[PDB]
Amino acid sequence: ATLTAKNLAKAYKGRRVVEDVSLTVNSGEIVGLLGPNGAGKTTTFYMVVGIVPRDAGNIIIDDDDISLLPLHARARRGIGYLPQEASIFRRLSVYDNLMAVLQIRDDLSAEQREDRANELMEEFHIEHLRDSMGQSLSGGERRRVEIARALAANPKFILLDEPFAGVDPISVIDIKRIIEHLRDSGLGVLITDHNVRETLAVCERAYIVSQGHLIAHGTPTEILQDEHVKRVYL
Template sequence: MTRTDGATLRQPDRMEAYAPPAERPVLEAIDLHKTYGRRHVVDGVNLYVGDSEIVGLLGPNGAGKSTSFRMICGMVIPDRGRVYLGGQDVTDWPMFRRARDGQMGYLPQEPSVFKKLTVEENISSLLELLGVDRKARLRRTDELLEEFNITHIRKSKASGLSGGERRRLEIARCLVSNPRIVMLDEPFAGIDPVTVQSIQAVIKQLRDSGIAVLITDHAAREILHTVDRCYVIYQGQVLINGTPEEVKLHPKVREEYLGDIT
């Protein structure tokens, strides 16, 4: 299966062997397939995410991007293909084990905070579930509150947070287990333009701190202004893997998906 590098724009060639990157990536998905009934939703998707890299996964509705993302995260079992985290084959691991043992963080599309708990309790409770002792819990909670600029609302109930504050808390919760990669599902959904810019800055902050990020979202413009590299899925296959500028200039991507997005 074809996986082009970031400098090459190509249509997928199913007869060509998959060539992995020179260095072992944080995440690698190889030849993913998924069929529902008679419909081949994902048809040989290959992708990778390197260290400290933000990668987007885009595509029109029904293209197979969401199913590909869910297979990578462990929510859907592929009919064929493998998923690796840090070189470890995690294809058969459920999602919770990928998070616990595979150093993967995950932000769902739906609100994931405990509304009746305070901001700091939302973080410390997860650390407690991981078996972290009290002293270390307090230290790590303080670190995450400061890192995501939510120390001033630490005693506030999560139910009263703004959209941007909630997103920051949700991303902070993703980091309690010190993941090497964070999967973000629709991080820009339901938030205003100012908050979008704030969350884009947070995502780039993750990259700058050494954490890889894989994002899928319907907000193509916002994704392309955030990522270092992007895959576009079309009819179950990778149509292009390239930089945001390369993706925006690709004729087929413009025709079938992006239109005049700049």
């Protein structure tokens, strides 16, 4: 399956923070959207996920233009999303965090949701945290719960907004292995970072964004030799 954004644009108070951005991510690849803080990476995700109204552009899955669908209807079409900052429910257990999403899985019985919650906890190595409150977890543990919670919806694409932020060095390694596993599972993974070299290594290809504009696309090796990328990071 293919997720495509075309000619996205967004302005705040007359300032165009995203302008004419197009990108695509297919099942089974990790695609980066990388660039400085304030370049418009999150705004682009917001428009793809449906969180803020776009000023221009289209969001498409395969042959379906879903531009008019709100966030939760786009989710049913397969779009998953990891917010940039904490989004775990801070005073709900890890288990109840998973069940907040598993409760919308109409394809599952009571027992099957419990099974699926248990499988997700094993898969993401959080089963020792079942009754722990979200607030009581480290940044890395919270991150694993947040990713498991998005997967409870069974998305086809997952947009990871700076998944390494606020996570200690050891947990970063674990999140990287999670990302590879999500890709091996058939998800198209779109990931943002401002630290280009580190995240670039885990991408099959990446778009580079600067001041709301796409300036380059390529494999990591092409990006690191791209003259437009270079004249931006002089």
